[PDB]
Scaffold this active site. Structure first.
Site, mmCIF file in Angstrom:
data_model
loop_
_atom_site.group_PDB
_atom_site.id
_atom_site.type_symbol
_atom_site.label_atom_id
_atom_site.label_comp_id
_atom_site.label_asym_id
_atom_site.label_seq_id
_atom_site.Cartn_x
_atom_site.Cartn_y
_atom_site.Cartn_z
ATOM 1 N N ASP A 99 0.753 -1.227 0.003
ATOM 2 C CA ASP A 99 -0.048 0.068 -0.037
ATOM 3 C C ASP A 99 0.906 1.296 0.092
ATOM 4 O OD1 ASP A 99 -1.687 1.925 0.467
ATOM 5 O OD2 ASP A 99 -2.400 1.388 2.468
ATOM 6 N N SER A 124 -0.491 15.883 -11.869
ATOM 7 C CA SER A 124 -0.866 15.298 -13.130
ATOM 8 C C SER A 124 -1.157 16.518 -14.115
ATOM 9 C CB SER A 124 -2.195 14.292 -13.343
ATOM 10 O OG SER A 124 -2.600 14.505 -14.415
#
Length: 330
Positions: A35, A199
């Site tokens: 994770d 992004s």
């Protein structure tokens, strides 16, 4: 040193991925959920409340000649999905894919929430976010990656998750056979303890690319792609009959649909998520309403590039003094 381990979807939907991990001496092999959105290595154990164990493999520290109680240390964690676990702590030898760390904090669960009990395939979590998020008190502990780092050939690990197929976690090297083209690296902020990056925009299907900054985290422990409501609305508007259902808890779509792809930007590069990656199947067994793999982050407080996005790429988690992320197509 290096390590290389295969990671396998737990079910037909790629809800999560498990990776075998050796703990203790002799080895006890547990299947852990790696994770990159948390920083605790915790396991089902001989200490876990018996009614909360249903088919998981447990770690038994008393059977490990190298286990030592980390006296006084406790832990307690709550995840973004409402799940939780807590317990006490041992140090022991932990190996992943042939890479061994001695003295790793292994957080032994005394209690787990119902979602963990109900998932027989996940024996615990191995956190790969920054060690500043580790929950051990009163002495915070380091992740497996942070403990391995100085021994690795390069201070990196890579995630190569499969679509309905096994993939790979590598530690200490970048497999130049595992991706196509070049890797585009992008800056990381560690301020919240995550692999947080920005992004450069998105496109829906064959649509034009929208240049827009989207801050979010690279999180292998989250199934879906969670993005701003504007972006998510733009995506599902291209699917006839898609709608946001407050009763189901997100966007659903007709199972008869063919989904468009979704592209996200990494600097000047583009990662394309095929439409089939975004189909999470019937909302309930036999339903003709299917659950979408792109969902709004509006009720979270962070955008999350979870497995839906990450499995479309070869992803480099660069833990050099200045961390960075890299993405390549594959």
């Amino acid at each position: 040193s290096t390590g290389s381990a295969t990671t396998t979807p737990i079910d037909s939907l790629d809800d999560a991925y498990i990776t075998p991990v050796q703990i203790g001496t002799p080895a006890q092999t547990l299947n852990l959920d790696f994770d990159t959105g948390s920083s605790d290595l915790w396991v089902f154990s001989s200490e876990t409340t018996a009614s909360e164990v249903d088919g998981q493999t447990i770690y038994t520290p008393s059977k490990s000649t190298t286990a030592k109680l980390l006296s006084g240390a406790t832990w307690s964690i709550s995840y973004g999905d409402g799940s939780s676990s807590s317990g006490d702590v041992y140090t022991d030898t932990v190996s992943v894919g042939g890479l061994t760390v001695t003295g790793q904090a292994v957080e032994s669960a005394k209690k787990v929430s119902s979602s963990f009990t109900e998932d027989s395939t996940i024996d615990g979590l191995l956190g790969l976010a920054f060690s500043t998020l580790n929950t051990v008190s009163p002495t915070q502990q380091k992740t497996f990656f942070d403990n391995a780092k100085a021994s690795l050939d390069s201070p990196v690990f890579t995630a190569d998750l499969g679509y309905h197929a096994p993939g790979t976690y590598n530690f200490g090297f970048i497999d130049t056979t595992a991706y196509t083209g070049s890797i585009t690296y992008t800056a990381v902020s560690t301020k919240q303890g995550f692999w947080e990056w920005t992004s450069t925009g998105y496109a829906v299907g064959s649509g034009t690319f929208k240049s827009t900054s989207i801050d979010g985290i690279a999180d292998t422990g989250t199934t879906l792609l969670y993005l701003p409501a504007t972006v998510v609305s733009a995506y599902w508007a291209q699917v006839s009959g898609a709608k946001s259902s407050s009763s189901v808890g997100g966007y659903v779509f007709p199972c008869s649909a063919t989904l468009p792809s979704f592209t996200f930007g990494v600097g000047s590069a583009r990662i394309v998520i095929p439409g089939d990656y975004i189909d999470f199947g019937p909302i309930s067994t036999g339903s003709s309403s299917c659950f979408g793999g792109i969902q709004s982050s509006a009720g979270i407080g962070i955008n999350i590039f979870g497995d839906v996005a990450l499995k479309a790429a070869f992803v480099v988690f660069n833990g050099a003094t200045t961390p960075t992320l890299g993405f390549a197509s594959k």
